[model samples]
Target: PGAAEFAALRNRWVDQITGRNVIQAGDPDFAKAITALNNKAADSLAKLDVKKGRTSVFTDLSLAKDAEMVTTYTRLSQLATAWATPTAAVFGDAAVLAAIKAGLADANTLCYNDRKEEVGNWWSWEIGVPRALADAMVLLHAELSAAERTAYCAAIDHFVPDPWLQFPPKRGKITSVGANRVDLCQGIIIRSLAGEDPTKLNHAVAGLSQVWQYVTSGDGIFRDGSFIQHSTTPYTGSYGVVLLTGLSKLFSLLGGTAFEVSDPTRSIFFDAVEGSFAPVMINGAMADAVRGRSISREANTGYDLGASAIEAILLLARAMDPATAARWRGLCAGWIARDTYRPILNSASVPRTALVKQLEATGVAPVAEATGHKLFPAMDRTMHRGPGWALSLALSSNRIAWYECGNGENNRGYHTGSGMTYFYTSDLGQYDDAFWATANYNRLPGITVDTTPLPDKVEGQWGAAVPADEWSGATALGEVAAVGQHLVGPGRTGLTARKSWFVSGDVTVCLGADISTASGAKVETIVDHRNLHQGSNTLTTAAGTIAGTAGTVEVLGDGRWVHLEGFGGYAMLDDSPLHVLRETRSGSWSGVNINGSATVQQRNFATLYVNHGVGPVAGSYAYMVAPGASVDLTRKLLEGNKYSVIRNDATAQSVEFKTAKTTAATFWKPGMAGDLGASGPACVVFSRHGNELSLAVSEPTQKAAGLTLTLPEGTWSSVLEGAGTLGTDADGRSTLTLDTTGLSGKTKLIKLKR
Candidate 1:
C-alpha cells in the first residue's frame, strides 16, 4: 500500500468520497460502517497463522487463501480514516504489519523454491501462485524491508520475467498461446504494477494485444464463432474461463488509458462471449463438452455453479454499450435466478459497485430467449433449438481433432467427436446430481461405438491424434442445418463407420452407414443415456413399457418414447428392436472432475441403444430422435410426417421434409450425389419459401476448384455471392457452379430467386 501509485489510488478514493458523498467521515452511519469494517479486519487478521505463514481461514486453505492474505491489509487501509484515530492505529499496527511482512517472506521462499524452473500448471506455477505473490508484494511494499523487496521481486521476476529487465530473454520456456498466454500476461502485469515500471507494463500490454488478436483469430476463435484450444477441440467454458477472467481484469484496468484495447482485438472478447458462452448453455448449465478444464463444475457445486458465466455477463454488462449491456444484464440476472435462491457469487457484498447497482436497477427476471438455431462449421459442431428441445452435435476430422489434452482432460473424448450428440428438452433436467460422477464413460450419451469396453483412463499430455483426411468431418449451413460424417477407427479405436445427422425442427435424423468393427467387437449406436431420478424413469414402447427400476431389458418391438418421470421425454423413430436398459451407476466425482479430488456418488440412469451384430461388413441403421415430445406426438411424427429418404448409403444420405420445405444431405466424399430434383455432386442442403430458394453446399474433399449443381428445368436468378453465374444448359437444365477451394472446411450459402 506504500507504493506511490497505490497511495495515489487510495487518496483518489478518499477524494471521491469527500468530494460529494452524503455520508461524511464522522456521520453516525459512516461510523457504524467503519466499526463493522474494523471488526471484519480484526477477524481476518486473527485467522492468519503468523508462525506457519498460512491462512487458516477456510478449511480448504487453497490458493485463494494466499490471495486473501495479501488483500486483507489493503482492504483495511481502505476503511482507515484520519477521522478515526483508533482505526488508523489499527490499520497502522507495527506488529501486525511485521507479521504480514514475515509471512510474505515465507511466501517468496515457496514461489522461488525451484529457482528458474517453469512452475506447475496454471493453478500452481503458471498463474495462481505467481499472481498471489506479486499482489502481496505490491500491497505490502512500504512495510516490506529492503531485503524483502529484493527477494520477492526476484521470485516474481523469475516466474514472470521482464524481457526488458533481463540481460538476454530466457529461452525454451513454456510460453505457448493457449489459455496460458493470458496466464503469462497476468503474472507480468502484476509484477509490472508491483515494481511501478510503466515501460514494462506497456510491454506486457503490447504482448497481450498481439495474443488477444490470435486467440480470437483463425487459430483460436474461428470465423464461424468457435473457440479452440490445443490447436484442436472447442474449448470455451473451461480454459475459456481463464481467458475471459484474465482479460476482463486487464481490460478493467487499462480500458480507458493509453494502453486501451482497440477494435478487432477488443471485439474478440465480445465475440467469444456470444459464440462460446451463449450457445453451449442449457438449463442454466454450461455445456460439459466445450469446457476444457472446467468440466469439474458439474462435480463441485461450489466450483463454477453458474458463477463464471454470470460473472462474465456482469463484466460485459458494465463495460459494453447501454443497450448491449442491458440486454446481457437481463440475461445475467436470469441466469442467477436459474440457480434460484442460492446466494450468487460476487454480488452479496456491501458498498455495492456500479455493476451490482445496475443489476438491481434493471429488475429483470430469468427468461433466456432461445438462442434460435446455429451451426459452427469450423468446429464441426451444430446446435438445433426448436420450441421445447435443444440438441448439440459434436464432430471431428483430420482438420479438427476429437478432444483436447490438458489438466487431465478427456482422453475418451475420442467418441465425443465421433458424432457425439447431446439433447436437452424443456422437461428433462439437462443436468442431474449425478450427471458427471455416475456417467458411463464407455458409452457417452449419443455416439456409435463398439460395445467392448476399455480400461478407464485419460490422456494427460497434449497428443491426442486425429484423422489424417480433411474431408472426414462435416458441413454446416448457417443455423438451419448441418451434416457431419465421422470416419472413425483412427489412432484410438479400431471401428470404422460413416455417421451422419440432419437436424431440422423438432426431429434429428441419424444414420450409420458402412459401420464395421474389424476386431470382432459388436457395434452399438447409443441413442440416449439419461441420468434420471430413481424409481421414476420408464421406457414405453408399442409392445411394452419397462419400469425405470428394471436393471436392463431389450425392447424388441417399436419403441417411441422414453420418459424420466417428471423430468424429460425422448422419442425414437424406429421399430427395429431398440435396446433399453436402466442401471445403477456409482463412482467418485473425480472421474469427470479428473483434474481434482472429489467425493463418491451413486445414481440410477436409463440408456437407449441399437446393436448392429458382430463384424458386419455392410450394415446400416437410420433413426429420427425427437426430444421434448410426448408418446402421441412421436407416434404422429413416425406415422404421419411425410419425408422422403432420397438415399441412405455409404456414399451419401439425404432427407427431404416436404411440409417443412427443406432438404438435408451429407456426402461422405467427392463424386457422391443425391437426387435433389436435379442431381448434383456435393454435400448440400436446400430450403425454399415461395419463390425464395436458399441452398447450402460444400465440397467434402475441401480441395475442389469449383462444384457445379444441375438444377431442375426452371429459370433462376442468383442473389447470393458464391452461387456463381446462373446459366441454363442446352438440355434446359439450370446449373450452379460454386468455388469449393475457398469454402474448404466451411459451408457456403447460395441464394437464388425463381
Candidate 2:
C-alpha cells in the first residue's frame, strides 16, 4: 500500500528497465495475445507485500550469523523500502535507515565477533564501510542519535586505522562491499543537500577521493577488463560500479560544494563512464539481460554495461543547470519513441520477457519464449505477492542476469571461465545463478582466452615458473589470458614495487632494461615490466640499472623513444621466418622458414639503443585466432619474431594485425639485431639520422589472400577530443581530407581520445 507513497519511485524504477506496457513497476502488466489468453499471472503484483516479518531479518535461521550478509541485506531491504517511500518526511520515514540505526545500536551483538575488524579488504574491510557510515551520519546531521555517531566512529576506527595503507579483504574477497557502501552513503549524503558542518562532508568527500586512488587503475581504467577482476570475484567489483555511479550521483548531489577538487582524477571518473557508456547504450548493450543474466565480456560486454550508460546519462543530464534536464529527457524520450530506438530500449529492458523477440532475432538467447512470462515476476501463480527476502533478491538478480547475458557481451573474463552470474545470489548462497553462455566452442575461441602472458619457466627464479591456468568460455571467442607474473618496478624512481601480476590483465613482464642519457646524472631505473607493454614513453636522462634472474640487457640512446611491446600471443607460420635454425646462442643466418610448436621467449632488446642499432623488436609475441601458434628460434637476436596488436573488428580477418603505422615498418626482430642489407638479414640497422622505430612486415605479405586494407590507409585525419575529429568539420565541412587507403579489415579510425 505504501508503494504509491513515493512520488517518482515508479518512474525511477521502470523508466529504463521495465516493459513498455507496464504502468507500474510491480503493480501489473496485463499484456495478452487475447482476452482469455491473459494468464492468471497477468495484471497482479506478485512481489509486493507490506507485512512486517515478510522480509528476512536477523531472526532468519541461516542469515542471522552472517554479520556481513545480514547488514548487507538489511541495508538493501531498507534501501528498497526507502526508495519505495522516498516521499516520506520526518526523522524515521522508512525502515532502511531505522534498521541501519538498529544495527549500529546493537553493533556488538550482530557483528562478526571481534573479527569484524578482519572481515573485508583494504577498501571495504577498512575504508569503504566505515567511510559510508560516516558519510550517512554527516548527511543525517542533527538527526543522528548520539549512539549512532559513536557507532559510526567505532566502525571507522576499526577499519580505516590510517588512510595510507592499502586495505585487504579480511580473508580473500576482492570486491570490497564496504567500499560500495561508502559510495552509496556518499551519494545519499550529498543528495540529502543538508547544511552546516561543511568540513565533515568535505572530509567524507576526501575519503572517497583517497579510497578510489587505490581501487581504480593507476592509469585510471576501472577494474581490469578481466573476469576475476569482476566485483563478484572480489566481492567489490559490483561495488566498484556502485562507487562510480555513487560518485556520479554525488556530483549531481553536490556540485555546489565550494570544497570541490579538480584535475586528472575528476576527468578520469567521468571519461571512464563515457568510454563504457557510449559504446553500450548506442550499441544496444545496456538493456535488461536475457534469462536474468548480464552481458558478459566473453561476449565482449561488461557486467556493469547498463549501469554505465544509465547512471552516466542520468548524471550528465542532472549535471546541467535545471534548464537542461528537460532537454535531455526529451531527447531520450524521442529516441525511445523510434523503431530504431529499440536498440536503446533493448539494452534497458527489465527481463527475459522484454527481450523475447529481439533475442530471438539475434539467435543468441537460450530460452526462446518466456519461461514464466514474467522475468521479474512480482506475484506468484496465485497472484499473491512473493514472500521472503531471498526470493525478492533472486527475482532482482535473475532480472539483472537476463539483461547481462541477453545483451550477449564478452564480459566474463579470466575470472569465472565465462558467464559467472553473481548478482543473483543472496549472502547465504541459497539463491544463485550462472549467466547463460556458450562455453569452449572452439580452439580459436579457446586460444583467444587471453594468452598474453608466459610465466617464467625457470623455478625459484622470481618470474612465473609454471604454465598459466587455461580456461575457455563457450559464449566467448577462444582466449587464454596470463595466469600469473612476477615483475619489478621503476628503479630510478626509487620505489620498489612488487608485482605478481595476475591474469586479470595485470600482466607483469618480469624482466629488466637500462637506458642512460648523455648525462651521468644516472637515475638507475628498472623496467616496471608492466609499463613496457603499455606504449608509454617514460624516459629518464639519468643512467639506469638492469638486473634479472636470467641476466640483464642494456641499451644507450639519444633523442629516441624506446617502444617495447613486451607481451603477446604468437604462433609460428609455415611460410614466415620468426626464427632460423641454430644449436646455440651464436649462429649464422640460414634462410630456412618453418613453423613449430616452440614459442621462443623474446628476451631483452633495445630499439634506438646505442642510437638506432636496428629495427623494432617484435619481442616474440603475436595475437591470432589460428590453431597452435608458435615460432622457431636460435637465440639469435637478428632472427624475425612476429608481433601484433589486433583490434576488435568483426570481420573474419579481425584476428590479423593488418594495420601498419609505416609504409613498411621494419619486421619484428626478437632480440637485439645488428645490421642488414648486403651484410645480412641479421644486420638490419639505420640510426644515422635519428633513432629508428621498429616495423612489421607489410600487410600484403602477411594476410591470408583476397584480403586488403578495410579502409583507405592513407586517410589523414585530425584528432578531436570527444568521439573523433577526423572526417569533417562541425558543419559537414571536410577539413583535413585523409586518404585512408591501406587500413584493412581491422579496427579503423584510431584517434587518440582524451
Candidate 3:
C-alpha cells in the first residue's frame, strides 16, 4: 500500500489467493494453483529483515512483502479453517501450516510492542493482534499441538486478559460497547472451545450477548432508529454495519448451542433493522447523513457502497417478519442485479443460515411501498421517506459530539451541526462519485452557516455542549411528518437558529426562524446542492424563469422554484424570502472531505440559497423543496400558498399539510401545554384517512410524571403505548392518561378508536 504500483500489485496478489473476499481454492484445479501460491508465500515469509514488535512501515519492498505474507497466510489459514474440507486439503500442505503457526508464534511473542496492563486497544497492546492470533488458533485447532494452543492462548490472554479478569466482563464492563466487546468476545469464545472449558464459555456467552443487547437498547440506538458510535457520530454506515454483521454471524455460530443468542437480543436486532436500516435505505442506497467516517475514505466511491449496506440488512432481516424481510430484499433487488448475491453469499461475516436460504429461494418481486419517517434524537437525525423522495437531516446536539475527526475521515463535518439536510429523488448516489473531493467544504448541502471558510481540519474533540434551551425532534402522523431542530453551532461559531421542515404530499415546507449570530461571519441558508452536469438548470422566481448555463444570477424578489430539469426542483416558500440568488460554483473530487491522491475530477455545482449578508443581527427564510415534482406542481404550490407553519419557536414547532390532512408538532420542552385546537402536555400529531383517525403522542422530556391527552368527540378504540390506560370523559371527548414515569425516554405510539 506504499506506492501506487505496489498497492496495485498487492491487490493482484490478494486476488490470486482470495478474489474479492471469496476464497478461490474451493475448486480442485483452483486448489492446486492456490497451493503453489502458498508455497511461494511461505518461501517469501522465510526471508524478512523484520522488526518483532513495532508497526513496520511498507517503505521497503522486501520487508513489506514479507509482512504482507504473514497477513496473507493468516487469512488463508482462517479461510481454510472456516470452510474446511476442500480448503483444508488444498492449503493442506504441512509446510504452509507450519508457516502460519510460526507467524502466530512470532506475533504472540512480541505483541503491541510487548506492553499494556489493561483496556481496549490497551497500552498499544492493540486488539487487532490478539484477535487475529486467536482466530488462527481456532481455525487450525486440529492441527495445533497442545503446546501451540497453550502458547497462542497466553498471547491472547496478554491483551484480552479474560472475561474472568474483568470480573465476568458482562454488560457493565469498561469494554462493553463497540469493537472492544465484540473482538474480545471472539478470543474468549474460541479459546474456550479449544480448551473445552464451560466456565470460560459461559462468561464469553453472557458477556458477548449483553454487549449485543447494550447497543440496541440504549443511547447507541435512539428511540427513533438513529445509530451513533464513538460517542456522537452517526455511524449506521461504518460502525453500525460492523455491529449488525458481527451479531448476525455470532448468533449464527452460537445457534443450537448452550450459548445461543437470547430471544430478547434477537428482537433488538429486528428493531435495529427497521429503525436504522429501513429509513436511510433508498432504492438500495444509504442516505449521506448517516455515512459519517465513510465520507472521507478513498475506498468510498460515493455515499452508498453499492450493495454493502443492504447486504448486511438482508442478513439481519431474517430475524424479522416475512413481510418486513421481503420488503427490505425488494429494495435490494431494485438497486443491484440478482447475480450480486454471490458476494453476499461468499462474505465471511454474513451468516448463511436457514432464513437466509429461505429469503434467497423466495426471491424478490415488486412490492407495494408506503411512506414513513424516523427520528433518532440521541443521534440527532431525521429521515423521511415519501413517494417521490427520501430526505434526511443531521445535527449536533448536547447528546452527540460534532464529528469524528481522528483519522482523515470526516474532518469536514463541522457543518453537520448547522442542520445539514440531504435530499434525494432517484437515489442517494448524488454524491457517490467525487463530490467529496471537489465540493466547497465551506458550503455543505442544505446547511445554514456563516460562509466563512471552515477549519480545514476538524478537531478531534467532543463538541461543545448543546445548551439547555436547545432540542430537536420529529413527529409523524400517517404519511406526513415534521422535522425541526434548534440549529446550534459550528460549535465554536457562536451561532444559533431555529429550523423545521414539514414533509407531506409532494412538497416539503422548509422554515427558518429566530436566526441570529455573533460569529462575525456572514450567514446564509443553502437551499439546494446538485450535480453540475446532470441537466440544464433553471432558477425561476414567481416573476419569470431565468435559464442559465453557469453564473451567479441575482433575482431581486420573492423566490419561487429551482428546477434541475431531469433530477428535481425546490419551490421556495415565500415565508420571508427577501433575497434570492443562484450561483455556479466549482469544486474538485480530491477536496470533498480531506485532500487525497485519488484521481481528481473537476465538477461544477449549481447552488441556490437566501443570503444573510455580513453582520446580520437576525435573519429568517423559508422555502419548499420538491424532490421529484413537476414544474407545474412546483409553481402551483408556491403561487397558491398551500402550506402553513402553525408555530416555529422555542416553545413548540407545529405545521399543517393541507393536502394530506395531517397536523404534526414537535415540542422543545414539555410541560408548557395549551389548547392549540388540541389539548395535551406532550407533543402530539393527528391524521385522518376517511373515517380512521390516528393520534401519536409523547412526553419529549421523558421526565414527566404523567400526560393526559384530551381529544374531541371520541371514545378509545385501541391504545398502543401498552403502558397507557385509556379513559373517557364528559362531552364525548376522549381522555387518555399515559404513565411517563416508567417510559424510560422511549416514545409512545398510541392508536385511538374514533
Per residue, candidate 1 scores C-alpha lDDT tens digits across 545-632 of 7644567565745446554454344555445567778788887755654544566677777877888889877667777776766766
lDDT of model 1, residue 731 = 65
lDDT by residue (1-754, candidate 2, tens digit) is 1223121222332222223332223322112211112221121112223245433334322233333433443343233222222221222444545554444344434552233655423334443345334434443444566665555555554554333233444444432333344453453233222223344445556655543342321211333221112221221123334455556545544454354444346544544343322221212223222112222222223333433434344445555445444443443332233223223333332222333333223332121111110111110000000111100111111101101111112222221211111111111111111111222111111111112222211122111121221111100001111111111111111111111100101111111112122222222211211112112222221133122112234432221112222222222222122210101111111100111112222222111111111221211122111111111121111123222222111111011111212111111112111111111011011111122222111111111222111112222334432222334333332222222233221111223211
lDDT by residue for model 3 over 1-754, one digit each (tens)? 1234322332332232233244333444344434544454444445432564533311122212333433543453454342333343334566556655655555444332234333332412324445455556556666778887776666556556564233223334355565455655655766665555566656766766544354433325654566666666777766676666566555555655566666566565567766676666655556667766566665553233435565556655655578887776776555443223223233322122222344446777634334676766556677777776777787665555556664345667667656777775653446654566556565676777876666744445433334343555555666676666677666466667777777775667777777777778888888866665444556555567653535645553554565556556676555444333344444443454443565646555666677877776656777777777776766676553367666655555666677677776765544222333223235567765555556666554445688776653345556543556666655555677777784433456666555
CA lDDT of every candidate? 0.59, 0.26, 0.56
Best by lDDT: 1
At residue 278, candidate 2 shows an lDDT of 29
For all the candidates, what are their Cα RMSDs to the real structure? 6.0, 21.4, 8.0
Flag the better candidate by lDDT, 2 or 3.
3
- Give residue 211's lDDT in candidate 2 (0 to 100): 36
Ranking by TM-score: 1, 3, 2
